[PDB]
Amino acid sequence: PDSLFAGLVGEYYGTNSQLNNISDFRALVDSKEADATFEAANISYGRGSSDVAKGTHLQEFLGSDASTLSTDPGDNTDGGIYLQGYVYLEAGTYNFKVTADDGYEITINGNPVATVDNNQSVYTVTHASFTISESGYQAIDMIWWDQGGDYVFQPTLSADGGSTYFVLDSAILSSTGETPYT
Ligand SMILES: C[C@@H]1O[C@H](O)[C@@H](O)[C@H](O)[C@@H]1O
Ligand SMILES: [Ca+2]
Ligand SMILES: [Ca+2]
Ligand SMILES: [Ca+2]
Ligand SMILES: [Ca+2]
Ligand SMILES: [Ca+2]
Ligand SMILES: [Ca+2]
Ligand SMILES: [Ca+2]
């Protein structure tokens, strides 16, 4: 079965084709089995240089989560991650504020809540609010990629109208939606 841990299910995919947008990365995910799996328990990755998909840059980027890699991917020019699972959120209003190079998309309960559909050097976007109607574990997924060069990915979330933001980590993540005791 699907292991229960305090994190999202992570998949890494590399390619020697150019990633320009969300569609390109999603097509890469659809095209093959993941080059590596991991547990995404502390979703604040990077920053680094000289291509995420080369050498040990992925390990450096994933940091605290890299010890759960299923393998050490070989070199590629371009690469990214697909995260999916659950996040505990009380009913209320929230918004993401994301620092990234290159682009990304986060969905909650199937609906996009933070999107950058293009390549970019590091930039921080404060995204529009969204609502949670019922307290509990919410479905969440994320994609992020690097087309080359520098790389960073730090989604943060606010519950208090943008006064404070937190990283999504083992305090509130669940791989399956069951309560983790890990
Ligand atoms: C679009 C930008 O291109 C630059 O050359 C890269 O160094 C940045 O990391 C980013 O991907
Ligand atoms: Ca796949
Ligand atoms: Ca490697
Ligand atoms: Ca780190
Ligand atoms: Ca670790
Ligand atoms: Ca959708
Ligand atoms: Ca590229
Ligand atoms: Ca880049």
Numbering used by the authors: 10 to 191
Question: What sentences appear in the manuscript?
Answer:
MpPA14 (Marinomonas primoryensis PA14 domain) lectin is a domain of a 1.5-MDa adhesin responsible for a symbiotic bacterium-diatom interaction in Antarctica. PA14 domains share a β-sandwich fold and the presence of two consecutive aspartate residues in a cis peptide linkage (DcisD). The DcisD motif coordinates a Ca2+ ion that is directly involved in binding polar vicinal hydroxyl groups of various carbohydrates.
MpPA14 lectin bound l-fucose most strongly, with a Kdapp of 0.65 mM, followed by N-acetylglucosamine (GlcNAc) (Kdapp = 1.07 mM). With Kd values of 147 μM and 170 μM for l-fucose and GlcNAc, these two ligands had a greater than 2-fold higher affinity for MpPA14 than did glucose (Kd = 350 μM). However, the well-resolved 1-Å electron density map in this study unambiguously showed that fucose bound MpPA14 with its cis 3,4-diol in the gauche conformation with a dihedral angle of 47°. This helps the endocyclic oxygen atom of fucose point toward L11 and hydrogen bond with the sidechain of Gln156. Additionally, the hydroxyl on the α-anomeric carbon may hydrogen bond with the sidechain of Ser130 on L9, clamping the pyranose ring tightly into the binding site. The additional ionic interaction between LecB and l-fucose can explain its enhanced affinity (Kd = 58 μM) for the sugar compared to that of MpPA14 (Kd = 147 μM). The addition of 0.5 mM l-fucose was extremely effective at blocking accumulation of lectin on the diatom, as the free sugar outcompeted the cell surface glycans for the binding MpPA14 and displaced 95% of the fluorescent signal.
